[PDB]
Symmetry: D3
Subunit: 291 residues, 6 copies
């Protein structure tokens, strides 16, 4: 980015202006996972983009996952799994490990990366200041709803206390664990938690970092790649999508139907994908709007 | 506490008044460890006492340890230790485990206990919002200062951001990990960190929960138990004390010399020891003042 | 309270916690009269309990009476009384004396007692900053409503200005005099004024200090002493109660029906009765709730 | 004021402008006593002028006396006086009467008069919120300093809490009683208290209402009437002035030497003397400045 | 105003009190034009009266015209006019001159005059901070509505930003130019703009300075001069009034019907007419109220 | 900017981050003149860049000139000039025209351009709220200091009121006219005024838009173009520079010596020069630092 003429650098920056205006002073919830979480270059760029948003007066809120790190630690601890369908059962023991890995390892890495740019990141779970609660969820397997232990969905969100934190200039980094109404902590799917946080905070956008170019309606036909789709059309397409994309699409559906103006499935394998999706018209991601 | 006449219950409460006046609106830093951390009755009472202080308009700040929980997890993970003197060397690997256990397990338990009473507790480390930094420390072994890895002392404290948190009505629960000036996270001894936080926050008291009645000057002579001692006298006595008491005494010395009006070594095996030490004249603990 | 074991002192304090949580940040209106007002030990303890509430972050508001002090001063001044039924007629002259005694003597004593603990108490009447107004009341005598001069009921309350005063950390001590809509100051019964202030301020509790154990439904049968009663049941019982208890019961009825969660008739002859009633389950008083 | 041409009414108002600019947002302490306190027309006009200042964004603070009302009440109560020199001895009994008359009668009348114009006036003594303290004073009689009981001078003033009250839009009406360092309430001379309040509050002016045209240097020579004098000249003249003027002059001296820009001795027998002195160049009063 | 006795000066000031109470803390919009704008004595007095209101805690907002100054500058620039009916057509060129004269000359003179008394005046147009917008208006000529270029009516007003300016202690001086919805700046009649600003700001009064004694219903019969009239009566009279008075009357109608409590047509040829109309009962102006 | 690969657009934006961090929450004063003021494309881009800074949480303050527009209007009005040396004498008449052109024409155009992006721009002069004052300046001609009328330098700046305006989210657009201590308005050179505003506001940068690539030390040698120079070196070079560059260089000297961290002479003929200079390392401008 050095031989590139200076009048072209100017145009690239100037074209950010309409999106800076759209997002100034607004909440943007970003689900962070996949290869954006595992490669040092993609990670460092993600943390820089969070600092970028913050130094534009945008209020990012990061919700992270960590499925494979949990599995890796359970295997290290010799904790034998129980599986119903394709789901590990989250016993009290598995929860303790999940919480310890998500909050004490995965979230720590991102907090420190972001904080290389300033005193921005702060880690939290639903446990802290009772910021949100969980309700136990069942899963459908072989056509029957089934209990797989201490896993849940976001129940209620302390919207005011959460926005107080971003008003202090902080970037919350959320590990998806929260107590139920009896104080018993559950693990929440990070994609669904991200949609719930976006709706509760009145976010202007929900970004979903995934390891794909975007939503293909007829995978693997390359021409089936769509760049914008409405919730009604997308809900009808949901039964036909691969297993990995369903939670990302359900998230976008719940968020946009919940009033979030747009949710985006963007390619987490692209360095600075957040900057590309937010401040550029050239993203490969797909945008979900209501309709 | 039922056959006890009602006019005696009244006198007990009324005698709390001078200490409520002393502490209203003031910061009290509490080092929490030992059996107060491991027994369910002592723990639940500790969490209730933190809620008590908060519902009196006192601002508690909890600094916790977790030495044995770390050791237990290292053994579970099969991480062979290296030892210089009696000190485990904190390699990058051992740090990751220490941080994950302290922040993702030990701190979580206390946060949830306290939060059974309200949205009070919030967990943090020096990493979050760069709340404090560490400087690597050496230890003296066989008369020579020696490096034992990523262990440090508190360097600087973001006093303003920390007090903003208690001003929100929060009870910080601090896990003693913090980055050095290069962003590399160190493990800090919880006793020393507690003294450093007390001094930086202008705390009115530092409480040190330990598993002993109090400071014995000539252990094990029962009559050597003292109830108040000045920093000058206590510094001269420090070379003669058992190994377990030195860090607790050094903490009290640094805090009180640092301007904290008093530091207290109190018996963490007594249910509601905090209430006893703060709102009663009948504590067995020992009080350190400057002189 | 010295030979009493330390673990019992701890339990007494710890059992205050649920009521500290209930009252933190809340308004508590206390009608103060009777022997609690005349004996030096009961008085000093009352003032200490007001300071106690204030140093817990509770907002006490004190409404005081002074019937007998007024009578005593009228006799000293040689002011001959006029009586309709059992009621002294409050001429302009009698009002001046009542106001001067209530505000310039009785209220002064309590303000100074409370202020021995800090800059808390502040005296006021409805006259000051037009904090409340009066409407002239008649009384029923021999079955006919009758004018007995410048006596009234609370008309309107400047809720906002009153709460601004407690927000400053002040403890208002209210002498029950207030202007009517024409600026003419009336004397208001202190029991009824206390209920009116409680309702207007959204108080969490109304305490009525009286010189009896509590409400007896069939005085003097000792077993008729009740510890909790609903407003509907109590309204039906009101025509059967002794003359001294009627104003205290009407007060509790108006307050609780007015939305105050509970009103309490407690024994003002018990040292620290406020502490006993608020922070203990062993009070002899009776609690009024809606039903 | 009806046949007077309209262009003359305009000029009178327009000439108020430089003094409105001088006083906007500033504290003005007014000592109120004499015939301005006893005649219904002068009183009602005084209260209106206090409302005038308040509705210009000026912050009046009223300090009142009441010597003769106290004497009258003592005689009504049959309280025999003890006299040293020309001074009544203020026994505990005489204090109670003084406080009750000053705060519960004299201050009440002014509060109600002012409040006919709005929720402005609020009565206070040094007792309330420990707004100020007293130190016992002796008097010189026949050349020897002598104790005459519970009479004092203002010791310390809670400047911040007092200015908080005027910031709320209130007009404090101060009765000059205050506790000493042991909580024992003393009666303070109202002229001296007014000067002390002016200095502590950083008042822009001190007004002293008296029943004379102004300072005569060689009473009763009519030409000895001066309209402005400096503190140095006036201090030298003080030993030669009549008994009634000394406290008013000592007050002006202490205030202006204390940094109050000017103190004024104005004729309280003139209806609306405050308006005349503050917003007009035609006052008969005398102005004291430093020099 | 020197031989006039001092007790008469006092009465004049004291009679201002009810209107100071009415206006304290309230917005007063003043249309300023005519001879009040062109004579140095009337101008300087107008600026002083704006400073007077400000130093009483009243919030004046000045809307100014400048018709003849515009004409004079157009003639100096040799800009030939086009006229439909009696209306100059406001071409883009004529607008530039109008804006430059109104904002860069006429408004500057008033700002500087007012600012001789303090940092009060601040000049603005609808362009600044998009404080208000315009909508293009047509005029009726020979019975047909006709376009006369870039002239409009106030469309929307940024009420909040405007009141923020007066809350800072500023006196806005408004030049009536504002952009339409496409950013194209229009010239707005100053009388109509003044009524629109008064209604949008919730003004307590609208003052209309004109070069006449007041509204004559049957000009030139001297007895037809009315001092107060309701909007319904005045609307019926509007078709019968001289050409110069129609815009002033339409303004008062729109304002008072828009909820402004009263609008006043006052004689701008009287020195200090504002002071006379606001703080005196002797104004020759006419008051419009709803009915 | 369309065929350019998306990973290059990302890198351009990401490289803005260190300068966004440097400028977030900081004041940047921009002198705007030259061709950046006269060409529609350069102007519209300048206004967009001001909106860009504002939507990043940067606080721009624009100081504008307008020399040639003034000359053009004087010629249109037939105002014959008087010239001493090469300086037009600013008579009272010439000032009125200068003020009317600068504030009522030139500043209006920029305000409206900026406001196409939001309610940002607000026009002001030193006259408004007495935001700054002028002191009359002389010029040196043929070796003698000479009066050329109502031209001056910035004297004092109301730093607090000016920063209150940018705190409201406003972008001040300053026309360089201000009253002297006697209220007489002077015209101030816009380059010098810009440096004075930067120093008084504690600006982080001063940008000087000019119609040259940057400072040439040995014009017209192309290799004499420097990209960074210290104040000491640059002061020594000042006597050797062309006439047009002297005011721009004196400005940078006064600002940087006045404590402004850096002042920049940048090429106003480059579209989006502000974006290029601030958020890019590829600017042709020259940076002045202290040394």
């Amino acid at each position: 980015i050095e031989a590139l003429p200076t009048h072209i650098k100017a145009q690239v920056l100037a074209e950010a202006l309409p999106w800076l205006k759209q997002l100034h002073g607004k909440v943007v919830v970003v689900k962070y996972g996949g290869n954006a979480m595992t490669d040092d270059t993609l990670r460092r760029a993600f943390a820089a983009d969070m600092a970028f948003l913050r130094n534009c007066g945008i209020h990012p809120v990061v919700v992270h996952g960590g499925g494979p790190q949990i599995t890796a630690m359970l295997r290290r601890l010799g904790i034998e799994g129980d599986f119903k369908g394709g789901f590990r059962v989250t016993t009290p023991e598995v929860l303790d490990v999940a919480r310890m890995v998500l909050f004490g390892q995965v979230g720590r890495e991102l907090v420190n990366l972001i904080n290389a740019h300033g005193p921005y990141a702060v880690g939290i779970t639903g446990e802290d200041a009772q910021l949100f609660t969980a309700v136990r969820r069942s899963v459908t397997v072989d056509g029957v709803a089934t209990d797989i232990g201490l896993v849940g969905d976001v129940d209620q969100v302390n919207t005011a206390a959460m926005l107080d934190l971003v008003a202090a200039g902080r970037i919350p980094v959320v590990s998806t664990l929260a107590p139920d109404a009896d104080g018993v902590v559950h693990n929440i799917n990070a994609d669904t938690a991200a949609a719930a946080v976006a709706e509760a905070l009145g976010a202007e956008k929900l970004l979903m970092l995934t390891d794909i170019d975007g939503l293909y309606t007829r995978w693997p036909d390359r021409d089936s790649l769509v760049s914008e789709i409405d919730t009604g059309t997308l809900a009808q397409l949901l039964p036909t999508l691969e297993s990995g994309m369903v939670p990302k699409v359900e998230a976008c559906l719940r968020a946009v139907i919940g009033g979030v103006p747009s949710a985006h499935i963007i390619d987490g394998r692209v360095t600075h994908c957040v900057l590309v999706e937010l401040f550029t018209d050239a993203g490969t991601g797909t945008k979900v709007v209501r309709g």
